[PDB]
Amino acid sequence: HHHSSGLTPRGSQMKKIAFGCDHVGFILKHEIVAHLVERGVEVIDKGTWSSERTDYPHYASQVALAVAGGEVDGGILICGTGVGISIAANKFAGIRAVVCSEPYSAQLSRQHNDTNVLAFGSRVVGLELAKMIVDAWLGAQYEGGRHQQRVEAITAIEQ
Amino acid sequence: HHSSGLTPRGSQMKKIAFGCDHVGFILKHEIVAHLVERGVEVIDKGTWSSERTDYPHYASQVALAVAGGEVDGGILICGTGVGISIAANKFAGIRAVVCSEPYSAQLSRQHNDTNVLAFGSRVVGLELAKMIVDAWLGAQYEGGRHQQRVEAITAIEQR
């Protein structure tokens, strides 16, 4: 095949992912899940399954609790904006969710913040950009070192 | 002039607590300048130089003021904006949005009634950062059905 990209997706560092989205984020579900699978990750689908209106806090909770309980390597959430569901996830102890609309913020969130949950908006980003964003997040690895102090600090606040 | 296609709505927040990384410092003066140009009283919580410093501290200064009702909202800038927003969201009563475009910031306000905005000085340019803050300051929480979702967020944090 082609090897034409300028930025190559490094192999995923997370083997199984817990997935969640609301009725608006559902617009990207299939294709995103399909992408995850094609990149070799096992997807634990925590709903939903339709565009019928539903509440994002539940999906953020399902994936959040799974990620925290160590039953999955990471979590991926999608709502129209990604912001709300992202906040909900960050409210759980042991969770560090990043919401963004470009690759850099995602890649760096892993590297310096060791994030375990990624979110984006189906109404903000297209499918291709979204996939590049997930690639960047999945392939990235935490760098530790001076950052362990900052992440350690975030766990302190969770007080 | 009146030449813009999107008009910045008069600011709903009259006083906010600002905070930043040594990397976010890159945008401090111009953003605070813009804030003041919009008629908002900025409560500067450092840092004040490009010398390395930990972002968790400043996310804590702003958050505590936001929750303590001694300011109408908070704004944070680190290299990416992700780290500080995660830190901020860990504080009870705080709902922080991190983004790189105006839509997310505006909607986070309307539906999630966010009280903390964060962005990256290495991700977004100055003019885009200003647009995003206009979208955030001028937007208003729509309540209604979205109130259940916001209530759902506080519920999970306290339990």
mmCIF file of C-alpha atoms in Angstrom:
data_model
loop_
_atom_site.group_PDB
_atom_site.id
_atom_site.type_symbol
_atom_site.label_atom_id
_atom_site.label_comp_id
_atom_site.label_asym_id
_atom_site.label_seq_id
_atom_site.Cartn_x
_atom_site.Cartn_y
_atom_site.Cartn_z
ATOM 1 C CA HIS A 1 0.000 0.000 0.000
ATOM 2 C CA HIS A 2 0.727 3.712 0.191
ATOM 3 C CA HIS A 3 3.190 5.160 2.731
ATOM 4 C CA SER A 4 2.357 8.738 1.707
ATOM 5 C CA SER A 5 1.360 10.337 5.002
ATOM 6 C CA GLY A 6 3.745 12.869 6.535
ATOM 7 C CA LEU A 7 2.691 11.876 10.064
ATOM 8 C CA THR A 8 2.576 8.089 10.663
ATOM 9 C CA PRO A 9 0.330 6.563 13.359
ATOM 10 C CA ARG A 10 2.518 4.748 15.875
ATOM 11 C CA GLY A 11 1.088 1.430 17.126
ATOM 12 C CA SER A 12 -1.576 1.866 19.810
ATOM 13 C CA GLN A 13 -0.388 1.812 23.433
ATOM 14 C CA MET A 14 -3.897 0.942 24.684
ATOM 15 C CA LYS A 15 -5.162 -2.546 23.845
ATOM 16 C CA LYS A 16 -8.798 -2.203 24.866
ATOM 17 C CA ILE A 17 -10.916 0.939 25.022
ATOM 18 C CA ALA A 18 -14.270 1.712 26.643
ATOM 19 C CA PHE A 19 -16.401 3.766 24.255
ATOM 20 C CA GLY A 20 -19.274 6.106 25.009
ATOM 21 C CA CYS A 21 -21.362 8.801 23.291
ATOM 22 C CA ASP A 22 -24.716 10.561 23.442
ATOM 23 C CA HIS A 23 -27.270 11.000 20.651
ATOM 24 C CA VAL A 24 -25.296 13.803 18.973
ATOM 25 C CA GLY A 25 -21.920 12.107 19.335
ATOM 26 C CA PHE A 26 -23.526 8.912 17.980
ATOM 27 C CA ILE A 27 -23.092 10.498 14.525
ATOM 28 C CA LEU A 28 -19.419 9.463 14.598
ATOM 29 C CA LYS A 29 -19.795 6.174 16.530
ATOM 30 C CA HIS A 30 -19.756 3.467 13.867
ATOM 31 C CA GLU A 31 -16.944 4.883 11.735
ATOM 32 C CA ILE A 32 -14.842 5.758 14.818
ATOM 33 C CA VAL A 33 -15.409 2.352 16.408
ATOM 34 C CA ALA A 34 -14.649 0.734 13.053
ATOM 35 C CA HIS A 35 -11.413 2.742 13.004
ATOM 36 C CA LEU A 36 -10.485 1.665 16.524
ATOM 37 C CA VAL A 37 -11.033 -1.987 15.633
ATOM 38 C CA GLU A 38 -9.026 -1.661 12.406
ATOM 39 C CA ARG A 39 -6.155 -0.318 14.498
ATOM 40 C CA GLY A 40 -6.354 -3.404 16.665
ATOM 41 C CA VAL A 41 -8.092 -2.224 19.817
ATOM 42 C CA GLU A 42 -10.939 -4.046 21.547
ATOM 43 C CA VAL A 43 -13.915 -1.738 22.005
ATOM 44 C CA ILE A 44 -16.165 -2.108 25.050
ATOM 45 C CA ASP A 45 -19.229 -0.343 23.692
ATOM 46 C CA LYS A 46 -20.994 1.428 26.548
ATOM 47 C CA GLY A 47 -23.748 2.797 24.324
ATOM 48 C CA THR A 48 -25.499 4.401 23.003
ATOM 49 C CA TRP A 49 -27.073 2.945 19.873
ATOM 50 C CA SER A 50 -29.299 5.720 18.384
ATOM 51 C CA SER A 51 -29.750 9.418 17.686
ATOM 52 C CA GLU A 52 -32.732 9.467 20.050
ATOM 53 C CA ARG A 53 -32.018 12.079 22.724
ATOM 54 C CA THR A 54 -30.158 10.791 25.779
ATOM 55 C CA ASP A 55 -27.925 12.110 28.616
ATOM 56 C CA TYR A 56 -24.139 12.321 28.238
ATOM 57 C CA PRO A 57 -23.400 12.172 32.015
ATOM 58 C CA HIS A 58 -24.311 8.460 31.980
ATOM 59 C CA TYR A 59 -21.956 7.533 29.155
ATOM 60 C CA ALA A 60 -19.188 9.639 30.709
ATOM 61 C CA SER A 61 -19.779 7.708 33.938
ATOM 62 C CA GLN A 62 -19.822 4.233 32.334
ATOM 63 C CA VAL A 63 -16.515 4.782 30.545
ATOM 64 C CA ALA A 64 -15.055 6.719 33.473
ATOM 65 C CA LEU A 65 -15.807 3.972 36.000
ATOM 66 C CA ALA A 66 -14.465 1.328 33.624
ATOM 67 C CA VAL A 67 -11.194 3.185 33.056
ATOM 68 C CA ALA A 68 -10.779 3.845 36.794
ATOM 69 C CA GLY A 69 -11.541 0.226 37.711
ATOM 70 C CA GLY A 70 -8.748 -0.846 35.372
ATOM 71 C CA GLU A 71 -11.008 -3.061 33.264
ATOM 72 C CA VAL A 72 -9.964 -1.150 30.130
ATOM 73 C CA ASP A 73 -6.784 0.695 29.012
ATOM 74 C CA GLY A 74 -8.485 3.976 28.174
ATOM 75 C CA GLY A 75 -11.744 5.691 27.332
ATOM 76 C CA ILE A 76 -13.068 7.564 24.315
ATOM 77 C CA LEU A 77 -16.116 9.831 24.561
ATOM 78 C CA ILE A 78 -18.091 11.722 21.922
ATOM 79 C CA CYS A 79 -20.864 14.305 22.288
ATOM 80 C CA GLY A 80 -21.632 17.242 19.994
ATOM 81 C CA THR A 81 -18.867 19.320 21.559
ATOM 82 C CA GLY A 82 -17.141 16.712 23.705
ATOM 83 C CA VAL A 83 -16.764 19.351 26.427
ATOM 84 C CA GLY A 84 -19.668 18.436 28.694
ATOM 85 C CA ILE A 85 -19.064 14.704 28.661
ATOM 86 C CA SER A 86 -15.365 15.524 29.133
ATOM 87 C CA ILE A 87 -16.051 17.528 32.308
ATOM 88 C CA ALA A 88 -18.244 14.744 33.720
ATOM 89 C CA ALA A 89 -15.428 12.227 33.224
ATOM 90 C CA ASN A 90 -12.874 14.513 34.886
ATOM 91 C CA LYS A 91 -15.073 14.567 37.990
ATOM 92 C CA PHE A 92 -14.135 10.939 38.681
ATOM 93 C CA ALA A 93 -11.085 10.142 40.789
ATOM 94 C CA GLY A 94 -8.266 8.581 38.790
ATOM 95 C CA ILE A 95 -9.517 10.046 35.537
ATOM 96 C CA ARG A 96 -7.806 12.657 33.377
ATOM 97 C CA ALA A 97 -9.841 13.446 30.260
ATOM 98 C CA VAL A 98 -8.715 15.637 27.405
ATOM 99 C CA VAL A 99 -11.173 17.294 25.049
ATOM 100 C CA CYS A 100 -9.807 18.855 21.833
ATOM 101 C CA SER A 101 -10.245 19.405 18.084
ATOM 102 C CA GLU A 102 -6.668 18.784 16.871
ATOM 103 C CA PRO A 103 -3.874 16.119 17.200
ATOM 104 C CA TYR A 104 -1.301 18.170 19.106
ATOM 105 C CA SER A 105 -3.344 18.674 22.273
ATOM 106 C CA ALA A 106 -4.167 14.973 22.341
ATOM 107 C CA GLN A 107 -0.597 13.771 21.789
ATOM 108 C CA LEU A 108 0.791 16.201 24.346
ATOM 109 C CA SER A 109 -1.928 15.304 26.908
ATOM 110 C CA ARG A 110 -0.573 11.763 26.989
ATOM 111 C CA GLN A 111 3.079 12.801 26.991
ATOM 112 C CA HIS A 112 2.835 15.334 29.799
ATOM 113 C CA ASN A 113 -0.443 14.537 31.489
ATOM 114 C CA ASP A 114 -0.840 10.785 31.072
ATOM 115 C CA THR A 115 -4.484 11.198 30.089
ATOM 116 C CA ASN A 116 -6.650 8.064 30.082
ATOM 117 C CA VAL A 117 -9.784 9.515 28.459
ATOM 118 C CA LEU A 118 -10.134 11.353 25.130
ATOM 119 C CA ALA A 119 -13.161 13.303 23.882
ATOM 120 C CA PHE A 120 -14.136 15.398 20.883
ATOM 121 C CA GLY A 121 -17.255 16.864 19.291
ATOM 122 C CA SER A 122 -19.054 15.291 16.351
ATOM 123 C CA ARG A 123 -20.318 18.823 15.629
ATOM 124 C CA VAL A 124 -16.870 20.391 15.774
ATOM 125 C CA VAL A 125 -14.533 17.970 13.995
ATOM 126 C CA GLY A 126 -14.951 15.948 10.824
ATOM 127 C CA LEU A 127 -14.415 12.175 10.735
ATOM 128 C CA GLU A 128 -10.937 12.281 9.206
ATOM 129 C CA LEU A 129 -9.643 14.889 11.666
ATOM 130 C CA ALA A 130 -11.252 12.919 14.518
ATOM 131 C CA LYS A 131 -9.423 9.769 13.400
ATOM 132 C CA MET A 132 -6.099 11.636 13.229
ATOM 133 C CA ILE A 133 -6.830 12.922 16.720
ATOM 134 C CA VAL A 134 -7.478 9.414 18.042
ATOM 135 C CA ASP A 135 -4.334 8.109 16.323
ATOM 136 C CA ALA A 136 -2.278 10.798 18.054
ATOM 137 C CA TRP A 137 -3.795 9.983 21.438
ATOM 138 C CA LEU A 138 -3.584 6.188 21.152
ATOM 139 C CA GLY A 139 -0.001 6.068 19.920
ATOM 140 C CA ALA A 140 1.377 8.590 22.401
ATOM 141 C CA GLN A 141 3.080 7.527 25.618
ATOM 142 C CA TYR A 142 3.508 9.305 28.964
ATOM 143 C CA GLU A 143 6.983 10.790 29.462
ATOM 144 C CA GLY A 144 7.021 10.988 33.284
ATOM 145 C CA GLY A 145 9.998 12.789 34.799
ATOM 146 C CA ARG A 146 9.198 16.374 35.780
ATOM 147 C CA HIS A 147 5.529 15.846 34.860
ATOM 148 C CA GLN A 148 4.936 13.171 37.500
ATOM 149 C CA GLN A 149 4.885 16.044 40.008
ATOM 150 C CA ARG A 150 2.072 17.842 38.163
ATOM 151 C CA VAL A 151 -0.029 14.690 37.673
ATOM 152 C CA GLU A 152 0.702 13.750 41.277
ATOM 153 C CA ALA A 153 -0.671 17.207 42.185
ATOM 154 C CA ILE A 154 -3.897 16.618 40.286
ATOM 155 C CA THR A 155 -4.388 13.467 42.338
ATOM 156 C CA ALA A 156 -3.822 15.568 45.445
ATOM 157 C CA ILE A 157 -6.669 17.937 44.622
ATOM 158 C CA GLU A 158 -8.992 14.979 44.138
ATOM 159 C CA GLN A 159 -9.151 15.419 47.903
ATOM 160 C CA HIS B 1 -16.441 49.555 11.687
ATOM 161 C CA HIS B 2 -19.278 47.017 12.206
ATOM 162 C CA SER B 3 -17.604 44.898 9.520
ATOM 163 C CA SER B 4 -17.397 41.603 11.417
ATOM 164 C CA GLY B 5 -19.775 38.772 10.574
ATOM 165 C CA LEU B 6 -19.971 37.607 14.190
ATOM 166 C CA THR B 7 -20.574 40.321 16.775
ATOM 167 C CA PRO B 8 -19.048 39.927 20.285
ATOM 168 C CA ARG B 9 -21.973 40.141 22.715
ATOM 169 C CA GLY B 10 -21.508 42.471 25.663
ATOM 170 C CA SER B 11 -19.701 40.531 28.386
ATOM 171 C CA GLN B 12 -21.920 38.774 30.890
ATOM 172 C CA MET B 13 -18.988 38.301 33.275
ATOM 173 C CA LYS B 14 -17.747 41.490 34.871
ATOM 174 C CA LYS B 15 -14.922 40.000 36.931
ATOM 175 C CA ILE B 16 -12.736 36.933 36.315
ATOM 176 C CA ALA B 17 -9.636 35.328 37.808
ATOM 177 C CA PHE B 18 -6.778 34.856 35.326
ATOM 178 C CA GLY B 19 -3.981 32.324 35.652
ATOM 179 C CA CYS B 20 -1.274 30.806 33.488
ATOM 180 C CA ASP B 21 1.753 28.587 32.912
ATOM 181 C CA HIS B 22 5.182 29.980 32.064
ATOM 182 C CA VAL B 23 4.282 28.819 28.539
ATOM 183 C CA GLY B 24 0.804 30.320 28.725
ATOM 184 C CA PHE B 25 2.474 33.542 29.816
ATOM 185 C CA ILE B 26 3.127 34.078 26.081
ATOM 186 C CA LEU B 27 -0.445 35.357 25.787
ATOM 187 C CA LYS B 28 -0.936 36.915 29.256
ATOM 188 C CA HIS B 29 -0.563 40.633 28.558
ATOM 189 C CA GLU B 30 -2.493 40.783 25.269
ATOM 190 C CA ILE B 31 -5.306 38.556 26.582
ATOM 191 C CA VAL B 32 -5.577 40.544 29.838
ATOM 192 C CA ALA B 33 -5.481 43.672 27.665
ATOM 193 C CA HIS B 34 -8.371 42.352 25.591
ATOM 194 C CA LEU B 35 -10.239 41.361 28.748
ATOM 195 C CA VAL B 36 -9.960 44.889 30.072
ATOM 196 C CA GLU B 37 -10.956 46.224 26.654
ATOM 197 C CA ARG B 38 -14.168 44.221 27.081
ATOM 198 C CA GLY B 39 -14.833 45.845 30.435
ATOM 199 C CA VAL B 40 -13.905 42.998 32.759
ATOM 200 C CA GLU B 41 -11.834 43.343 35.929
ATOM 201 C CA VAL B 42 -8.971 40.859 35.781
ATOM 202 C CA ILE B 43 -7.700 39.304 39.017
ATOM 203 C CA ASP B 44 -4.145 38.266 38.117
ATOM 204 C CA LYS B 45 -3.006 35.100 39.877
ATOM 205 C CA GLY B 46 0.360 34.715 38.164
ATOM 206 C CA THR B 47 2.545 33.667 36.934
ATOM 207 C CA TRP B 48 4.448 36.783 35.895
ATOM 208 C CA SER B 49 7.504 35.465 33.965
ATOM 209 C CA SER B 50 8.492 32.852 31.403
ATOM 210 C CA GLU B 51 10.443 31.024 34.110
ATOM 211 C CA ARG B 52 9.304 27.406 34.468
ATOM 212 C CA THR B 53 6.533 26.789 36.956
ATOM 213 C CA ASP B 54 3.888 24.184 37.715
ATOM 214 C CA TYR B 55 0.427 24.729 36.239
ATOM 215 C CA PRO B 56 -1.521 22.947 39.018
ATOM 216 C CA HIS B 57 -0.886 25.904 41.347
ATOM 217 C CA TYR B 58 -2.507 28.555 39.146
ATOM 218 C CA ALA B 59 -5.411 26.267 38.253
ATOM 219 C CA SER B 60 -5.999 26.065 42.001
ATOM 220 C CA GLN B 61 -5.873 29.836 42.506
ATOM 221 C CA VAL B 62 -8.455 30.507 39.804
ATOM 222 C CA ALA B 63 -10.668 27.547 40.692
ATOM 223 C CA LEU B 64 -10.927 28.443 44.360
ATOM 224 C CA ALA B 65 -11.893 32.033 43.456
ATOM 225 C CA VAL B 66 -14.439 30.841 40.887
ATOM 226 C CA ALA B 67 -16.072 28.462 43.389
ATOM 227 C CA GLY B 68 -15.674 30.951 46.250
ATOM 228 C CA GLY B 69 -17.945 33.328 44.360
ATOM 229 C CA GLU B 70 -15.347 36.089 44.656
ATOM 230 C CA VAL B 71 -15.162 36.304 40.858
ATOM 231 C CA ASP B 72 -17.587 35.632 37.939
ATOM 232 C CA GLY B 73 -15.410 33.082 36.151
ATOM 233 C CA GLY B 74 -11.871 31.965 35.460
ATOM 234 C CA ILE B 75 -9.554 31.916 32.458
ATOM 235 C CA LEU B 76 -6.438 29.769 32.197
ATOM 236 C CA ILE B 77 -3.620 29.497 29.664
ATOM 237 C CA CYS B 78 -0.859 26.882 29.639
ATOM 238 C CA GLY B 79 0.997 25.585 26.590
ATOM 239 C CA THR B 80 -1.949 23.362 25.704
ATOM 240 C CA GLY B 81 -4.630 24.292 28.227
ATOM 241 C CA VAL B 82 -5.468 20.654 28.831
ATOM 242 C CA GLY B 83 -3.423 20.121 31.991
ATOM 243 C CA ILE B 84 -4.810 23.138 33.864
ATOM 244 C CA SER B 85 -8.411 22.425 32.808
ATOM 245 C CA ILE B 86 -8.182 18.894 34.213
ATOM 246 C CA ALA B 87 -6.796 20.319 37.436
ATOM 247 C CA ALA B 88 -9.558 22.959 37.565
ATOM 248 C CA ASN B 89 -12.361 20.460 36.891
ATOM 249 C CA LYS B 90 -11.165 18.470 39.913
ATOM 250 C CA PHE B 91 -12.453 21.286 42.141
ATOM 251 C CA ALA B 92 -16.055 20.973 43.272
ATOM 252 C CA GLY B 93 -18.436 23.418 41.639
ATOM 253 C CA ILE B 94 -16.080 24.009 38.725
ATOM 254 C CA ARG B 95 -16.998 23.274 35.124
ATOM 255 C CA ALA B 96 -14.062 24.131 32.874
ATOM 256 C CA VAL B 97 -13.921 24.061 29.073
ATOM 257 C CA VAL B 98 -10.674 23.737 27.106
ATOM 258 C CA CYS B 99 -10.833 24.396 23.355
ATOM 259 C CA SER B 100 -9.236 25.782 20.182
ATOM 260 C CA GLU B 101 -12.327 27.241 18.495
ATOM 261 C CA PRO B 102 -15.277 29.540 19.422
ATOM 262 C CA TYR B 103 -18.105 27.054 18.931
ATOM 263 C CA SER B 104 -17.077 24.718 21.772
ATOM 264 C CA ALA B 105 -16.549 27.623 24.180
ATOM 265 C CA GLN B 106 -19.913 29.197 23.321
ATOM 266 C CA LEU B 107 -21.840 25.942 23.539
ATOM 267 C CA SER B 108 -20.051 24.850 26.743
ATOM 268 C CA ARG B 109 -21.514 28.007 28.201
ATOM 269 C CA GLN B 110 -25.062 27.704 26.837
ATOM 270 C CA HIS B 111 -25.518 24.042 27.813
ATOM 271 C CA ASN B 112 -22.915 23.227 30.463
ATOM 272 C CA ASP B 113 -22.893 26.639 32.155
ATOM 273 C CA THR B 114 -19.087 26.569 32.342
ATOM 274 C CA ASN B 115 -17.264 28.977 34.628
ATOM 275 C CA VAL B 116 -13.659 28.351 33.546
ATOM 276 C CA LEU B 117 -12.155 28.686 30.057
ATOM 277 C CA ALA B 118 -8.724 27.345 29.076
ATOM 278 C CA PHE B 119 -6.691 27.254 25.873
ATOM 279 C CA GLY B 120 -3.178 26.682 24.590
ATOM 280 C CA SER B 121 -0.708 29.374 23.627
ATOM 281 C CA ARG B 122 1.107 26.738 21.540
ATOM 282 C CA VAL B 123 -2.111 25.579 19.889
ATOM 283 C CA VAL B 124 -4.051 28.747 19.120
ATOM 284 C CA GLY B 125 -2.902 32.113 17.737
ATOM 285 C CA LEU B 126 -3.682 35.417 19.507
ATOM 286 C CA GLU B 127 -6.571 36.484 17.279
ATOM 287 C CA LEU B 128 -8.250 33.083 17.485
ATOM 288 C CA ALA B 129 -7.759 33.085 21.255
ATOM 289 C CA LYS B 130 -9.492 36.481 21.415
ATOM 290 C CA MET B 131 -12.435 35.250 19.343
ATOM 291 C CA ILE B 132 -12.795 32.219 21.613
ATOM 292 C CA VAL B 133 -12.853 34.403 24.723
ATOM 293 C CA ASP B 134 -15.466 36.725 23.167
ATOM 294 C CA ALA B 135 -17.636 33.702 22.433
ATOM 295 C CA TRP B 136 -17.203 32.611 26.051
ATOM 296 C CA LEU B 137 -17.727 35.959 27.823
ATOM 297 C CA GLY B 138 -20.783 36.948 25.813
ATOM 298 C CA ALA B 139 -22.617 33.595 25.983
ATOM 299 C CA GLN B 140 -25.311 32.760 28.525
ATOM 300 C CA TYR B 141 -26.508 29.577 30.214
ATOM 301 C CA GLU B 142 -29.841 28.417 28.769
ATOM 302 C CA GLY B 143 -30.926 26.230 31.689
ATOM 303 C CA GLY B 144 -34.150 24.436 30.846
ATOM 304 C CA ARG B 145 -33.466 20.775 30.108
ATOM 305 C CA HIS B 146 -29.689 21.250 30.330
ATOM 306 C CA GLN B 147 -30.127 21.860 34.079
ATOM 307 C CA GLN B 148 -30.623 18.110 34.637
ATOM 308 C CA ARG B 149 -27.275 17.395 32.957
ATOM 309 C CA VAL B 150 -25.480 20.053 35.039
ATOM 310 C CA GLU B 151 -27.098 18.683 38.210
ATOM 311 C CA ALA B 152 -25.908 15.236 37.165
ATOM 312 C CA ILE B 153 -22.332 16.531 37.142
ATOM 313 C CA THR B 154 -22.410 17.891 40.701
ATOM 314 C CA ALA B 155 -24.066 14.680 41.870
ATOM 315 C CA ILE B 156 -21.191 12.488 40.699
ATOM 316 C CA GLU B 157 -18.528 14.780 42.132
ATOM 317 C CA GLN B 158 -19.934 14.796 45.668
ATOM 318 C CA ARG B 159 -20.383 11.001 45.663
#
